[PDB]
Design a protein around this ligand. Structure first.
Ligand SMILES: Nc1ncnc2c1ncn2[C@@H]1O[C@H](COP(=O)(O)O)[C@@H](OP(=O)(O)O)[C@H]1O
Ligand SMILES: Nc1ncnc2c1ncn2[C@@H]1O[C@H](COP(=O)(O)O)[C@@H](OP(=O)(O)O)[C@H]1O
Lengths: 113, 117, 116
């Protein structure tokens, strides 16, 4: 049975301005392992990754009905799909992410069998 | 058991032009109760409230697989619960209705899933 | 019991360029029946149909955990019923498939949920 559902949309411009102002933004939004991936990328690619991780965590927060990013983590499997490797929920989590050159979107569904 | 699913995306500029046109748009899309909330807001937040209610209603109609016109907007209503989240207070369905809405300074999006246990 | 979930967004301009290439884009992406519907439309409405079928096929591939470039375009088919709702008439899956599509002047998006 379903126990929650949430979505989010975000402009890349908002993430770009946030990086400059408080140059510690990333350290507070990403975990250690996520951070390693961030620094290895460059250009638009680097910004698109940070933006997608922020949108995914926000969708999950809305799905649980609450308003701690450090106890949430999103990685990529060998085929390339994104999945939650760490979260305060013991059921199953179904996630998906997509983008364009101007913004990103994400969708989450929570289930308990 | 899932019994339906629908989504919608809309440009804010399109909703703003319709209101400025002075054609009775808001009165056609919103109920009396929804209208009371609309008039208490100001600026961009006022336009985003109308846009969100329009997007959610169109999304529900696709989940039913009928589209909206065979059924007007006055047959549906969306308010905010005691936790502050949007929900359907009126609709022709007896099961559980899962709804979510989001926006930026240029677009608004909505998603609906129907279920019965 | 849910078994998969996926979403996708596509730029109209990108589909247009692919077509302008003349390569033979539409022929590799659409089935015989989808193509017959495509040729009966014109103008913007024509470019919107092709873009929507591409977005839908990619959302299903991601819901299964892969990509459309690997699964193959000719193995999936999307039609419209007598009320206008879109649905999958052919696919390599045994359960139920729930789909929805929406568009603006510049973009198109789609969402899929798999159930067994
Ligand atoms: N009765 C119905 N139920 C569910 N979806 C419908 C419907 N009639 C039309 N649609 C869908 O809504 C889409 C129109 O998008 P929108 O009005 O949100 O911009 C159509 O795109 P297609 O004709 O390309 O399949 C179609 O998929
Ligand atoms: N095999 C796969 N199955 C499902 N999703 C996949 C996938 N391979 C890549 N993706 C996703 O597609 C996203 C890119 O979306 P787009 O379709 O607009 O190009 C990737 O973003 P990330 O690499 O940041 O995780 C990733 O989440």
């Amino acid at each position: 049975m379903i126990v929650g559902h949430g979505i989010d949309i975000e402009e890349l411009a908002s993430i770009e301005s946030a990086v400059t102002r408080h140059e510690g933004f990333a350290k507070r939004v990403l975990t250690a392992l996520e951070m390693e991936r961030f620094t290895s990328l460059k250009g638009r690619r680097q910004i698109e990754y940070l933006a997608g991780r922020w949108s995914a965590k926000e969708a999950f927060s809305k799905a649980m009905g609450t308003g701690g990013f450090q106890d949430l983590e999103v990685l990529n499997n060998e085929r390339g799909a994104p999945y939650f490797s760490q979260a305060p929920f013991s059921g199953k989590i179904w996630l998906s992410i997509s983008h364009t050159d101007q913004f990103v979107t994400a969708s989450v569904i929570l289930e308990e069998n």
